[PDB]
Design a protein around this ligand. Structure first.
Ligand SMILES: Nc1ncnc2c1ncn2[C@@H]1O[C@H](COP(=O)(O)OP(=O)(O)OP(=O)(O)O)[C@@H](O)[C@H]1O
Ligand SMILES: Nc1ncnc2c1ncn2[C@@H]1O[C@H](COP(=O)(O)OP(=O)(O)O)[C@@H](O)[C@H]1O
Ligand SMILES: [Mg+2]
Lengths: 97, 289, 304, 97, 213, 48, 197, 101
């Protein structure tokens, strides 16, 4: 739940998960399944691409470190709209009636 | 004589018109009544600031259905907050008739005139305001003794000469020849124009609100299909229509009920929509992610 | 008591009215106005039908000192009960401009009269922002994860507006404006699209500088505010997925009907092209015969 | 149960005396099982007639309404007719059916 | 005068001071430019109503494109009927110097079917093309004389009698026909009073001065 | 006393989505609106 | 502005006939006949022959039109109901069976069979007899079998109940039949409706 | 402009008080017309300046402007009672090449 949340990616190879939790591939598959039953993560599993694509994360307590991570994500989208907005000012100049 | 001696142009406030309408509409079908509070300036400008309703009755509008207790008390409530002025007249509802005073009201208007001679009666139709246009008219009595003294031209001196009418025969005879009409204009500040003009906090943020694309597919599918059938209609029209006399040809070969006009209209309509739909999708995909 | 103030629909009459009361007590220089709101409750939508002023004098030394007449409120209510008897105390309006924490004490006083939970309707008289001039709040009681006991605090309510059939058509009669937030023709929606986008840009920028203010300028940390931003990131769209490939495909289909319709109008307009040119040929014949006739017309004017 | 006397379902207004008896079969399908006792019917028992008075085509309008009910694309049901008469050879033979 | 228009609350005064502003800023042009900008921008009808005639009198007899360009904008784009009128009427004051081109400017404005605009198209032409007649001017006014709306009729009859001032049917027959049209209305009692007012005043404009002016 | 009456119809026929043909118990058919109180699926022919 | 007069509430009249393309005669179902203006840029192809139509409430004017499908006396009783008797309740009644399959079934399967031989088609079917003979039974038998659109009306569904109700109910049943043509209209009894005297 | 001022003018034109169909029973020579309104009863009512009693006749449908029932136009219709009988019975006509032999 920690690894998906903190990352801006939301697909992880089982290799990364295997190394972290010191589990075999048989047990990553159970662990992922349990998260889904209890409702602590929801998602779907490709054991043919070898990913776990999580699609929802349970909100939890947000501590000092996480706010900084949350914050940066927001600066990127704020700047992205502003850049994008100049072109849309530029184009279709004739009419703004 | 020595004054303008003409009926005021009632300037009804932004607050007031809505309030008479809400108060008349709840009581439809039964007749409604109430006081107009306002101030008198000029000789012919009354600005009606606010309204209050005098409670219902079981015999509806009467002189009798005036109660001094309700009128005076309600008045002392507004006094404590200093939003009271002076009674400049009164409103009441005929929803079963057109604009014109009924036989009862003219006698109620005579009492009211007595108290204050600038007293107006405004007849509100809450049932003909189910249109885009609100039906509302103002009248004030000209006395029977007044008609004898032929003082009717006095009241229409120094005006644009533009008056209002309501139906013919009975209604019209009462209007012009026993009472006097003056137009009604609407008064407002730039503070109130902003208060009305606004809407929600995501109405100014509703072009990012794309639609479900099932519905947009529906819009795509219908417009193309329908145009096949009006196009067919367009082919028949121009096979003939080329002898002499334009109207005749248009009556003969379906040139009235014009498909040429109608085919263009549909096309243009579905065309302006789909430019924005493409615009919307291209913005939301790139902007957010 | 309850929470049942999920939506607050507010009549346009009330707003108009509130500005009118505010000026006729002439409360300026940071003076406030309180009146009762009358209307329906025990509905998820709280309907604000009507308002009336209460005399209230608010101090300038403190914000904790005020005069309000309890005796006044009932008299006002019983007269209005005679008009329409679906009107009961559902809160009181503040004239803003902004929320106060001395309004909490006033809320508790209106809780006596009510049989619902008091609506505090900050009706701004300053008309600030291009969106609503109303934010709405209800005083609700909570404990919180911090170690905070029995808190009285005001939770924002989304504001909407509805109007009756009679009331709405009143607006339309008064005004005739076309608006800058309307979604009407091609031009108008082009304007809305740019405006809507820039709308979002403004709100997001605030959030970024608000985050800074927690973590260096010691504004309070609150799980409601953080929790909301997490949701944004989790349900964020993604491109380059098979969702995106499909969006392009949908996009071609909409480009496709625009292309077919563009060609269709070319045929109707070129029909018109020819026909102007046919009329010119006929008007030529008419013009030539005309000249013989004009000779006699020129002549008559010389002769007499 | 109802019920209907022979002559309290007869009305002055026409298409009002059709109205009750149509709507009384309707009632019978909600409140089912039902028994419909016509009591001492000889009133609209009458034959084709209508070389007499206008009364006899009033009889005729109301009689035609019963036949479409009894057997038609309107079908019954758990509704039952008990018809009590004091002489049955008054009747129209489409009410002997 | 600018300040006092806000303070008053009698309808006659609000109008009067809007006109009086226009009057005192005759001949001022560029001098009066700050005042024109302010009066047009006010959301009330009455200050705009004088507001138009401040251009007219300020740019009187000048051949400035900009003076004329402003007045055209007010006319179409302002959603108040009273506002539209005051702007059409004004054009004639500016274009006193060259009255030849004016029927082409207003051809458009006479085509349109708003009562207040047409009523003022008629006047604009009357003020401008006075002196000796103009054939194109006469022609435009001719739908406007025969108008359904009584106020458009009142204005129009007056306007032609300025154009064709003291002219005879021994010079121009079209003047006899136009006069004879005025006499029919004075006879007729089945029209409104509004048509009758304009008929009397306009027939006396022709024959003014004891037949000498 | 402050409550007004209501006039009965029945759903004669669906016209569109939001427009309905009722036959009022006045007798003449009207075309009417919907509140959000009712649903499309709670209306059906022969319901008063 | 012009859409607001196209909107609710509306009262339903019935259009009789034109006198013009922008003025028509309609009979309101309030039992008042009106000569009324017609709005331009409505279609008039279905309007000029009698059809249901929307008239504004207060003013009374032809401001919009309705399709003929909707504003039916009673809907199709043949797609929203299904016959309740088949030809398994038939055995005998074969004499009428040779004449009913000519009369009803042959113009539904194809009308043009008649046309090309150069026989013009028979009209209406009257079935007579004691009603115990299974007349009614035969109609339901071939209707389940052909499985075309069918209408269940009766004269107690065309009957007068207020002024000008009863002629309106007559016009509507045929209008419906033609729109989804071909169609079989069944009126179970015309005993009341028609009388020799 | 022709277009937009045709819409704005049709909003006025559509607004009526109700304008009926009457039929003339008979005239009276006081300059009035006895009109039986087709739903309602009979009212003797004056006429407009576009018509008079000699442009009006029995069994000819008139338009009425109804707030006094003041005759507007002759209608573009006329009823004939003999065709009522003849149609309702229903019979064609023939030639002698449809009888022959
Ligand atoms: N040929 C037959 N085979 C089977 N059952 C039959 C037969 N003829 C008639 N019946 C049954 O007799 C009954 C009467 O027939 P049906 O429903 O056709 O009415 P009908 O004679 O037209 O009566 P009315 O028109 O007076 O209502 C039905 O239940 C029908 O099934
Ligand atoms: N002289 C004839 N020529 C052609 N067909 C005829 C002739 N006479 C009879 N018919 C046919 O026979 C039908 C029956 O004759 P009809 O005129 O109805 O008879 P009636 O003599 O009883 O008045 C006619 O409609 C027509 O089809
Ligand atoms: Mg049967």
């Amino acid at each position: 739940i920690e690894t998906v949340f903190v990352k801006n990616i939301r697909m992880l190879s089982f290799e990364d998960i295997s190394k972290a939790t010191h589990l075999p591939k048989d047990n990553v598959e159970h662990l992922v399944m349990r998260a889904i039953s209890l409702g602590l993560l929801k998602g779907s599993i490709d054991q043919v691409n070898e990913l776990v694509t999580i699609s929802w994360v349970q909100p939890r307590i947000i501590s000092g470190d996480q706010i900084t991570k949350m914050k940066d994500r927001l600066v990127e989208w704020n700047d992205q709209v502003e850049k994008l907005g100049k072109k849309m000012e530029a184009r279709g100049q004739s009419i703004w009636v | 004589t020595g004054r303008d001696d003409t009926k005021e142009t009632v300037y009804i406030s932004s607050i007031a018109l809505l309030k008479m309408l809400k108060h008349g509409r709840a009581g439809v079908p039964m007749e409604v009544m109430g006081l107009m509070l306002g101030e008198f300036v000029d000789d012919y400008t009354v600005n009606v600031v606010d309204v209050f309703a005098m409670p219902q009755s079981g015999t509806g509008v009467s002189v009798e259905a005036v109660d001094d207790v309700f009128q005076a008390k309600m008045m002392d409530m507004l006094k404590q907050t200093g939003r009271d002025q002076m009674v400049v007249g009164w409103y009441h509802s005929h929803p079963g008739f057109g604009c014109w005073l009924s036989s009862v009201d003219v006698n109620t208007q005579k009492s009211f005139e007595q108290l204050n001679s600038r007293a107006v009666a405004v007849v509100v139709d809450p049932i003909q305001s189910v249109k885009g246009k609100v039906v509302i008219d103002a009248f004030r009595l000209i006395d029977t003794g007044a008609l004898i003294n032929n003082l009717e031209p006095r009241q229409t001196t120094s005006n644009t000469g533009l008056l209002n009418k309501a139906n013919i025969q009975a209604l019209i005879h009462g209007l012009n020849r026993h009472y006097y009409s003056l137009n009604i204009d609407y008064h407002k500040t730039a503070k109130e124009t902003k208060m009305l003009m606004n809407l929600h906090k995501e109405q100014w943020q509703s072009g990012l609100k794309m639609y479900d694309y099932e519905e947009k597919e529906e819009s795509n599918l219908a417009a193309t299909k329908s145009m096949v059938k009006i196009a067919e209609q367009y082919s028949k029209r121009i096979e003939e229509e080329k002898e002499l006399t334009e109207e005749e040809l248009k009556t003969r070969y379906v040139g009235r009920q014009d498909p040429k006009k109608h085919l263009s209209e549909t096309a243009d309509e579905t065309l302006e929509n789909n430019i924005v739909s493409v615009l919307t999708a291209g913005v939301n995909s790139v902007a957010i992610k | 008591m309850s929470l049942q103030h999920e939506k607050v629909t507010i009549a346009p009459l009330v707003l108009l009215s509130a500005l009118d009361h505010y000026e006729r007590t002439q409360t300026k220089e940071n003076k406030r106005c309180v009146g009762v709101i009358l209307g329906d409750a025990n509905s998820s939508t709280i309907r604000v039908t009507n308002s009336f002023a209460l005399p209230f004098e608010e101090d300038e030394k403190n914000s904790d000192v005020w005069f309000l007449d309890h005796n006044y409120i009932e008299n006002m209510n019983e007269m209005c009960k005679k008009i329409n008897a679906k009107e009961k105390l559902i809160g009181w309006y503040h004239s803003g401009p902004k929320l106060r924490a001395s309004d909490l004490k006033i809320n508790e006083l209106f809780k006596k009269y009510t049989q619902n939970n008091p609506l505090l309707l900050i009706v701004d008289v300053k008309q600030q922002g291009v969106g609503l001039p109303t934010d709405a709040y209800v005083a609700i009681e909570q404990v919180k994860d911090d170690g905070t006991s029995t808190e009285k605090t005001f939770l924002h309510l989304p504001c909407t507006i509805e109007a009756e059939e009679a009331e709405e058509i009143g607006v339309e009669h008064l005004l005739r404006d076309v608006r800058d937030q309307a979604a009407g023709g091609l031009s108008i929606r082009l304007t809305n699209q740019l405006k809507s986008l820039k709308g979002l840009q403004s709100k997001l920028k605030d959030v970024v500088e608000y985050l800074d203010k927690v973590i260096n300028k010691e504004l309070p940390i609150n799980h409601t505010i953080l929790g909301k931003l997490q949701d944004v990131f989790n349900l964020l769209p993604n491109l380059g997925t098979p969702d995106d490939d499909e969006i392009d495909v949908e996009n071609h289909d909409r480009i496709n009907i625009s292309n077919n319709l563009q060609k269709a109008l070319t045929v109707k307009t070129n029909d018109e092209l020819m026909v102007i040119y046919i009329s010119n040929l006929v008007r030529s014949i008419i013009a030539f015969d005309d000249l013989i006739e004009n000779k006699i017309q020129n002549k008559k004017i010389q002769e007499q | 149960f109802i019920f209907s006397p022979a002559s309290g379902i007869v009305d002055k207004y026409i298409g009002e005396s059709a109205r009750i008896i149509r709507e009384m079969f309707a009632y019978a399908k909600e409140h089912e099982p039902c028994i419909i006792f016509m009591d001492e019917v000889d009133a609209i028992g009458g034959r084709r007639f209508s070389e007499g008075t206008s009364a006899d085509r009033e009889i005729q309008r109301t009689l035609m309404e019963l036949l479409t009910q009894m057997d038609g694309f309107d079908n019954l049901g758990q509704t039952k007719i008990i018809m009590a008469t004091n002489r049955p050879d008054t009747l129209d033979p489409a009410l002997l059916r | 005068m600018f300040t006092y228009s806000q303070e008053t609350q009698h309808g006659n005064i609000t109008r009067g001071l809007a006109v009086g502003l226009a009057l005192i800023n005759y001949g001022r042009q560029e001098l009066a430019d700050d005042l024109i900008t302010k009066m047009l921008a006010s959301d009330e009808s009455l200050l705009r109503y004088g507001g138009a005639f401040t251009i007219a009198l300020a740019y009187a007899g000048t051949g400035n494109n900009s003076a004329v360009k402003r007045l055209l904008h007010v006319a179409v784009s302002d959603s108040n009927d009273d506002v539209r009128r005051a702007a059409v009427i004004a054009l004639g004051f500016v274009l006193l110097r060259d009255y030849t081109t004016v029927p082409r400017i207003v051809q458009l404005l006479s085509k349109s079917h708003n009562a207040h605009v047409r009523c003022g198209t008629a006047f604009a032409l009357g003020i401008a093309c006075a002196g000796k007649g103009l054939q194109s001017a006469i022609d435009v006014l001719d739908p406007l004389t025969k108008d359904p709306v009584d106020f458009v009729r009142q204005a129009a009859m007056i306007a032609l009698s300025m154009i064709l001032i003291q002219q005879t049917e021994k010079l121009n027959p079209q003047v006899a026909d136009i006069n004879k049209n005025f006499l029919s209305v004075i006879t007729n009692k089945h029209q409104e009073g509004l048509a009758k007012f304009g008929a009397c005043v306009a027939q006396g404009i022709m024959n003014a001065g004891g037949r000498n002016v | 006393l402050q409550s007004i009456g209501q006039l009965i119809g029945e759903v004669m026929k669906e016209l569109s989505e939001e427009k309905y043909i009722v036959k009022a118990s006045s007798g003449p058919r009207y075309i009417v609106g919907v509140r959000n109180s009712v649903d499309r699926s709670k209306l059906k022919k022969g319901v008063r | 502005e012009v859409k607001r007069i196209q909107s609710v509430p509306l009262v339903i009249g019935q259009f009789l006939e034109p006198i013009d393309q922008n003025t028509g005669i309609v009979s309101s179902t309030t039992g008042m006949s009106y000569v009324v203006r017609i709005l331009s840029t409505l279609d008039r192809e279905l309007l000029k022959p009698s059809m249901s139509v929307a008239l504004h409430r207060h003013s009374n004017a032809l401001v919009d039109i309705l399709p003929p499908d909707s504003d039916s006396s009673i809907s199709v009783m043949g797609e929203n109901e299904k016959p309740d008797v088949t030809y398994a309740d038939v055995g005998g009644l074969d004499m009428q069976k040779q004449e009913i399959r000519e009369a009803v079934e042959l113009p539904l399967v194809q009308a043009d069979l008649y046309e090309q031989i150069g026989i013009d088609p028979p009209r209406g079917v009257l079935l007579y007899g004691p009603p115990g003979t299974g007349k009614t039974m035969l109609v339901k038998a071939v209707a389940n079998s052909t499985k075309a659109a069918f209408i269940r009306v009766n004269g107690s569904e065309f009957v007068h109940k207020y002024l000008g109700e009863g002629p309106r109910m007559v016009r509507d049943v045929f209008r419906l039949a033609r729109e989804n043509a071909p169609s079989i209209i069944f009126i179970d009894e015309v005993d009341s409706i028609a009388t020799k005297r | 402009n022709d277009k937009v001022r045709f819409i704005k003018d049709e909003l006025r034109l559509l607004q009526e008080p109700g304008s009926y169909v009457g039929e003339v029973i008979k005239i009276v020579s006081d300059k009035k017309v006895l009109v039986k309104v087709q739903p309602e009863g009979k009212y003797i009512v004056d006429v407009a300046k576009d018509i008079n009693v000699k442009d009006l006749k029995a069994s000819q449908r008139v338009c009425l402007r109804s707030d006094s029932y003041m005759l507007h136009k002759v209608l573009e219709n006329k009823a004939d009672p003999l065709v009522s009988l003849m149609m309702v019975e229903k019979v064609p006509d023939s030639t002698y090449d449809m009888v022959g032999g």
